[PDB]
């Protein structure tokens, strides 16, 4: 334990008068060092001083043992031990500073100068035994609240003085960094609350479905298998399939999966002695709603490419030669215009070549589609020729990573062409729906996953899901591959943004 | 002391699992002043203004009977002297009283809970996992429970509320009667409470007399000296009959108690089926004398569709309206007169009307054709014909904001209302119109002005005679604007309208009233 | 008899004694004191100057002051290497009165969280408090402790404490005819008391709060136009000019908030970066549409703002060269000139907020070009009107609010330049005025200045001499006002320099300027 320049500092006897209850922790969790989450490092001999290798704030969230124990409490209190654990030889050199950041210091860059103006510690790469620190609870209330995110005192490691160091002509040399933490003798919880199960400290969790099994985002077909491709455009701008882990739905994605590539709408219908009947739609809600424009491109589920596409309507004939039939109009969406069809403003039209008079019943109709011909993956015409809102592109994504796409093949009319067509996914509507229903807290950047054999078990490749809801693979080839569609996705851990993955 | 004690008393068991809390210690050191409450305060329990509820055997293991936060609202006293006090600390003490038959049977669990935790479903398995006590429905003498000041700040705010713990009252097993005869007793518990040693205030401030808790009072008005809300009249009678609708959809005379209003209705008693417009004029060879109103605000501005499906005042009702007009004639001979309209705004007809825009339209059978100059008018009614107590149309098959219908009743709850007559044309007939309100003219514009806080759900009231200073009844004023009590007649009740209303306390939804 | 009363008793308060460090020590890191010497001395705050006029009724507010380091310059200079502080201090009011005023006001203690509606004269006496008459001779000092329920303060917010409040009592009146122009001045000074200290010592970062707001050392002739690309000519006020117009472009935050399309560099005005594609069939002559982006290459999407950054916020007909490149060989990239339409017009809907554009050049032969991207920037105007353009066809696009909200007197400084116009008959100039010219809508959003107050005063002095030409109010929102009450324009050399004096509230009155 090393001298820093601060006081002590008071727990439990400073809650005691105000707190109902103060509650014992399990002796033999005081004797073992855990890892913390988002506490690991690597230092090369190409970074420059001033980076930031590590910032962990104080709290429950540090152990696991902790992190389960808050769920039946009300508060908590108390100090911290931490180890850190550096993996260098005698022949290194560079130097490491580890500051203690009060709880209300503004958020920002920081510099080598200014990170030696806090209670701190320099270290040599060339350190034996970890390194131990205090984290002490700097506050100006009595006891914090489990289910609330407040600010404690932070931990925070950067680079002071680069490392110097050989390398062999295969792998270069790196130096590693591990951080591990206990409660201190004085820590304790407040109130025994009953146990909650959806608290801030719960881990993502996938479904156990396998993707042979799943609904595809943007086609209402199954997923026939998921791939990758440095071909195709590596920055795509769908409107369907994007979710946030958190649990928001981005662009016009519909909570569930039969609302995908259809939209509602009340039809009129206006025989013309030219080309001849066309129906006109004024769109609505799937579910039954009023149309608002706001900063959606369209109403949920609408299709989002350009082609063009059947659909098929239930409709009611007034006079008397029959009393119920079942229509096929066609939907124009090519860059050709002519007809102005502005989805936004809550509007489209469609037409057939049907003679005579065909005087319909306007009550309400929803159109799903038959087939398209002509498919392109661009975007449609959500307004007249003028700009919408809508949701941002795919990306960034770091150099050497490339999307991972579940793909799924649909219907086709057009004679040129003749082995098929192929849409693109970025996630299954199970996994949007997961999502969406469990409203998870996202802690960093990004999730570590792994797919894995059902039964044998081999691992056949690690990826990296974003909080915006796109999957990266770090792939290094010049075709197209495949995988297998037999697999489980796995969540392992939160990662940093700059995380290097293993290569295919 | 008592009759045969074949029952509890004392419920000497709680041993509760919790420690002793610091109160005005912590905050004297972080004061600027030297406060103190007075030493006779501390002496005596006195009811609660939220000390009443009821437990009946309609009720099912699981409802909430009370939940009280911790606070100077729990007590009348320290209830008016925070108004002169920014800061409050420390415990109280709390009494229940609840001491029913002795052929009565049940269980009910009172809990501690914590500041944080989250409101709203509290399911019966969760409230035993809580610092409780368990106590029988046949106990005698009251349960004394303390309430703790458990919080992670030196003092609290008087005004604006903050976390704090609370307590909780739930029926853990249902009520049941032994007896032989006809029917199930109804257990009336009362809560009463006092500070402990350590409670105090912080800070002295201007006593100022709309704050947050205070109390809802009501004007000291007979009803037959009160307006009508729905019709320009006095209000005549005092009402309860199930044979009328239950659940009204009136748009005038709607009201919330902590001063909102809902609907068309206005804050004077003028307004009530009158409406300020334009006014021009046209003559045709077919109908005769046209007239077109676009209808403004009655204070001189615009007219614009918003949240309401008309603009305030407008007739609710259906049926056709006979009205007076001032005009202006350029003719030599005369300058002023007043002419007699009629309109008709009950089931739709042929005829172009669109209240979107404001557009009201009247016909009249001339020979002569008039000229005349458009300008502004205001029509208060005369005369009702074929009146209909429903809504008229407002955009012609098309859905429009409107008031919720009103309601729901508990079983055997029934809608009071005030009634009026109006002047009606007839042909063959001779009964007098009659409509019904939920509140008159003068409780709107007392909620619209004093701008009340509520506390739970609804107003206990009780109807007192002044002439001989007899209660008549107790009813149940919901939040939203009205009157409820328990009747299980066929035929319609009629009551006195030289009583006053007496607010008694705040009560949940769930509060069973006595027959009538 | 028995006992004295005596009817004259010096004022006093009676406090009870709040505990700082003393609560803090156990939570807190360190604790950190400062220089004995601090607690010596009476100094000026940065919120420090109010004046009473006989326009000011009873139950106005003249000033309210927060508890904390922010009202000594030697506290708001040590805080910026803490992040927290405890304990009460002492102020100090002056008043600049005379034997013809008659007028009495309140001071009193205000604790937190009562609530912050509006206070009457009445409940004003309630409070512990002073009762100061205009006349006074002699500084007249309160004590502000340190009411709260936590243990310490954090520096980098204002969060809640005691306030100090000052309002008329009584309305000034003077025995003089009247009305004239008389105005007490009232300043405020303060110092620490015998219990304060800091927290936790943090490296000194300069850009915190409690820094006092400051202006660039440049001249206005060495300045550029925040609405028009040229250099900054005159600077004037006039009252027969639109008080309150609704301009577009140049418009900033003191806190650093761009609002508007104002963009940052004075490079992006009145010039657009779009993708144009041109075409000429049977008789729609050669059209160039233009799909817009931003300046800086990033894509386009209709937000908050009702155009692209620095697009043109004035009505008229625009001139405008574009390097274009032609197919044919034997001329490579050129410079066109296009006309476009600003304003209204038939035969065509522009809609810039929808990122859509056309122009119009003339032609005889074919002359074609190719498409790509293209940068637009002006070069002349015709039919030029300070109204905001068509930014849609028929609909309200997000637009900042106009300018207000003056006090009686007050007009609003102009900063004026001239452009390049095309006429036929008329041979006078065209110019367009600015409240806040270019590098002063920059150094905002590069300062992330807290504004503490409600207006700024500034000085505007000579280089060489010194003299003083007016005194004027630089409110929050971005612009100056001044107090004058003539009826022709009036003109300012623009060689002087804008220095801050403090912060002032609304209904500070500003000494009126002329001749």
């Not at 424009?293 to 239930?314: H, K, M, N, T, V």
Request: charged share 15%.
């Amino acid at each position: 334990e090393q001298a820093v320049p601060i006081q002590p500092v008071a727990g439990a006897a400073l809650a005691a008068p105000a707190a109902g209850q103060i509650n014992q922790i399990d002796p033999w969790i005081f004797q073992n060092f855990v890892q913390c989450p988002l506490g690991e490092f690597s230092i090369s001999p190409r970074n420059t001083p001033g980076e930031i290798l590590f910032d962990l704030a104080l709290g429950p969230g540090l152990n696991p043992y902790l992190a389960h124990l808050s769920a039946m409490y009300t508060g908590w209190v108390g100090n911290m031990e931490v180890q850190l654990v550096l993996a260098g030889n005698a022949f290194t050199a560079g130097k490491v500073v580890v500051a203690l950041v009060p709880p209300y210091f503004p958020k920002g860059s920081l510099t080598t100068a200014q990170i030696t103006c806090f209670p701190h510690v320099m270290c040599d790469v060339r350190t034996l035994e970890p390194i131990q620190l205090p984290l002490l609870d700097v506050r100006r209330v009595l006891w914090h609240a489990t289910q609330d995110q407040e600010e404690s005192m932070r931990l925070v490691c950067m680079l002071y003085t680069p490392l110097r160091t050989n390398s062999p002509g295969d792998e270069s040399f790196v130096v590693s960094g591990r951080l591990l933490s206990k409660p201190a003798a004085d820590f304790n919880f407040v109130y025994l609350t009953p146990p909650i199960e959806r608290t801030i400290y719960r881990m993502v969790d996938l479904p156990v479905i396998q993707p042979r099994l799943c609904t595809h985002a943007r086609w209402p077909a199954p997923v026939y298998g998921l791939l990758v491709d440095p071909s195709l455009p590596s920055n795509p701008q769908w409107q369907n399939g994007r979710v946030h882990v958190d649990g928001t739905l981005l662009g016009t994605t519909p909570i569930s999966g039969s609302w995908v590539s259809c939209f509602a709408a009340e039809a009129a219908y206006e025989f013309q002695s030219g080309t001849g009947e066309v129906a006109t739609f004024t769109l609505i809600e799937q579910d039954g709603s009023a149309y608002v424009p706001g900063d959606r491109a369209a109403p949920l589920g609408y299709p989002d490419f350009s082609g063009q596409l059947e659909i098929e309507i239930q409709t009611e004939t007034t006079k008397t030669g029959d009393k119920l039939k079942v229509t096929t109009f066609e939907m124009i969406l090519g860059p050709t215009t002519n007809a102005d069809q502005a989805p936004y403003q809550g509007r489209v039209f469609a037409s057939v070549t049907a003679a005579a008079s065909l005087d319909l019943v306007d009550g309400r109709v929803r159109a799903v589609p038959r087939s398209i011909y002509g498919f392109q993956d661009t975007i449609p015409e959500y307004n007249d020729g003028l700009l919408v809102p809508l949701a941002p592109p795919i990306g960034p994504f770091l150099p050497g990573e490339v999307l991972l796409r579940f793909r799924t093949y649909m219907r086709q009319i057009d004679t040129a062409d003749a082995a098929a067509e192929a849409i693109d996914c970025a996630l299954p509507q199970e996994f949007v729906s997961w999502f969406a229903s469990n409203a998870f807290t996202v802690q960093s950047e990004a999730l570590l996953l792994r797919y894995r054999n059902t039964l044998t078990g081999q691992l056949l490749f690690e990826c990296k899901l974003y909080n915006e809801g796109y999957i990266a693979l770090s792939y290094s080839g010049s075709g197209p591959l495949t995988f297998p569609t037999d697999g489980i996705f796995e969540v392992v851990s939160w990662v940093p943004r700059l995380y290097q993955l293993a290569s295919v």
